[PDB]
């Protein structure tokens, strides 16, 4: 008779996504117990803005989004409203309006390999900043100077994204941190997502 929103798929997925192509999962028609989230001792950051996770086990929202991706430790600061840097501006931007939670944890035992795990990637350039909750998976060669490169890389013309070098001996912060971001939707629409208490 179970019918809970599947947060087990979001947090316990064996492989995650690179931040430039961050995975979004929707939450609809279900009842989710949020006490499983905050009360499991494997989270290094659980910043909630404008909402408390211990106090919405009552209210029903229109729908909940769970964005999940993988960055490095020093970049978890950028997953916040009003931040700047290569991740907040070119990879995953949060609005200043943000109401939700950015949950993150150290994953050096899953997303590391001896010779480096280059499977996670981040965007270095684009000609403009990301709108909030925008996902740009473009691979167009970034034109850095006056020279226009018609699809061929060369001088002042680089590939727009590079890959992390996650080797397990790197100091903390050059280590992979998995991140899950919960955004909340509710006002003038049927609500199908809430909790028990």
């Amino acid at each position, epitope marked *: 008779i179970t019918n809970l929103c599947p947060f087990g798929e979001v947090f316990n997925a064996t492989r995650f996504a690179s931040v430039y192509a961050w995975n979004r999962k929707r939450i609809s028609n279900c009842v989710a117990d949020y006490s499983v989230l905050y009360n499991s001792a494997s989270f290094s950051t659980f910043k909630c803005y404008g909402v408390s996770p211990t106090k919405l086990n009552d209210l029903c929202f229109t729908n909940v989004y769970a964005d999940s991706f993988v960055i490095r430790g020093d970049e978890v600061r950028q997953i916040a409203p009003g931040q700047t840097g290569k991740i907040a501006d070119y990879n995953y931007k949060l609005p200043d309006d943000f109401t939700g939670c950015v949950i993150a944890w150290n994953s050096n035992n899953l997303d590391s390999k001896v010779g*480096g795990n*280059y499977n996670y990637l981040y965007r270095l350039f684009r000609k403009s900043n990301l709108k909030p909750f925008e996902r740009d998976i473009s*691979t167009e060669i970034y034109q850095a100077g006056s020279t226009p490169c018609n*699809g*061929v890389e*060369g001088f002042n013309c*680089y590939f727009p994204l*590079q890959s992390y070098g996650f080797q397990p001996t790197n100091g903390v912060g050059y280590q992979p941190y998995r991140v899950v971001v919960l955004s909340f939707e509710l006002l003038h629409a049927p609500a199908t997502v809430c909790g028990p208490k």
Partner: nanobody
Amino acid sequence: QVQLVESGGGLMQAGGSLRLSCAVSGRTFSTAAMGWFRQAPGKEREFVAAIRWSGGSAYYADSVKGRFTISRDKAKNTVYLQMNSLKYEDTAVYYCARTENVRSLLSDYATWPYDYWGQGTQVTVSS
């Protein structure tokens, strides 16, 4: 496991053409770039050409610019090296290499290490 297989080596007299193939099996969507290396007996391995899997822009060692053309077919996961105007300079064992390290700068693939290698095929120029 990922394994690369080289093809198309052999004997051919100078001035002629040769096309080598290197077929890849396994972890395919993780391919960042492929490259070709060669090694004559007693002399050290040298880069000749690399190609990015996404986009396909190529980087060439100066020694084969205008003579060698590196090519790739994503659908059947083979990288090619077209070797025209062969010289006796070009006789060596030619290795293809595969990396999953996506590097923003294309010339990185001339110096950075490659994770997986084939076992090579011999190209002999007869002058």
